[PDB]
Amino acid sequence: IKGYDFDKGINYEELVNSYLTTGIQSSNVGRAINIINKMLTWQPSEEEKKEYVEGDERLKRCTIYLGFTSEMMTSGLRDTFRYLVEHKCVDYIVTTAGAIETDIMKCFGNMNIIPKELIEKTKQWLKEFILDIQECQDTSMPFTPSQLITMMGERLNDTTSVITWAAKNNITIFCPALTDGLFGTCITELNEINPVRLMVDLVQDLRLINSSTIHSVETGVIILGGGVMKHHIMNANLMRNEADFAVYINTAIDSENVKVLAEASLVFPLIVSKTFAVTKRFDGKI
CA 174 to chain centre: 9
Q: Are 144 and 209 in contact (CB under 8 A)?
A: no
Q: Does 271 bind a second copy (CB under 8 A)?
A: no
Stretch that binds a second copy, among 1-9, 32-40, 59-67, 162-170 (CB under 8 A): 1-9
**Measured from the CB atom, is 217 or 262 closer to Cl ion?**
217
Q: Does 24 bind a second copy (CB under 8 A)?
A: yes
Q: Does 266 bind a second copy (CB under 8 A)?
A: yes
Q: How far is the CB of 172 from Cl ion (least distance, A)?
A: 12
Q: From residue 254, how far is each of 59, 128, 145, 167 by CA, in Å?
A: 22, 49, 33, 34
194 binds, among Cl ion, a second copy, none (CB under 5 to 8 A by kind): none
107 binds, among a second copy, Cl ion, none (CB under 5 to 8 A by kind): none
Strand, helix or coil for residue 14: helix
Q: Applying CB under 8 A, which of residues 28, 37, 83, 133 lies at the interface with a second copy?
A: 83
Q: Does 65 bind a second copy (CB under 8 A)?
A: no
Q: Does 59 bind Cl ion (CB under 5 A)?
A: yes
**Measured from the CB atom, is 91 or 103 closer to Cl ion?**
91
- What is the radius of gyration, based on Cα positions, of the chain? 21
Q: Are 71 and 265 in contact (CB under 8 A)?
A: no
Site for a second copy in 195-234 (CB under 8 A): 195-196, 198-204, 206-207, 210-211, 214, 227, 230, 234
Stretch that binds Cl ion, among 6-14, 18-26, 55-63, 70-78 (CB under 5 A): 55-63
Stretch that binds Cl ion, among 6-14, 73-81, 88-96, 173-181 (CB under 5 A): 88-96
Q: Applying CB under 8 A, which of residues 23, 30, 44, 109 lies at the interface with a second copy?
A: 23
From CA 280, how far away is CA 277, in angstroms rounded? Answer: 8
Pairing of strands 92-95, 62-68: parallel
Of 64, 68, 63, nearest to 94 by C-alpha is 68
Neighbouring residues of 119: CB distance < 8 A, sequence distance ≥ 6: 105, 182
Site for a second copy in 97-126 (CB under 8 A): 106, 110
Q: Applying CB under 5 A, which of residues 35, 36, 63, 242 lies at the interface with Cl ion?
A: 63
Q: Is the dihedral of CA 275, 52, 48, 210 positive or negative?
A: positive
From CA 52, how far away is CA 80, in angstroms rounded? Answer: 35
Q: How far is the CB of 231 from a second copy (least distance, A)?
A: 10
Q: Are 244 and 256 in contact (CB under 8 A)?
A: yes
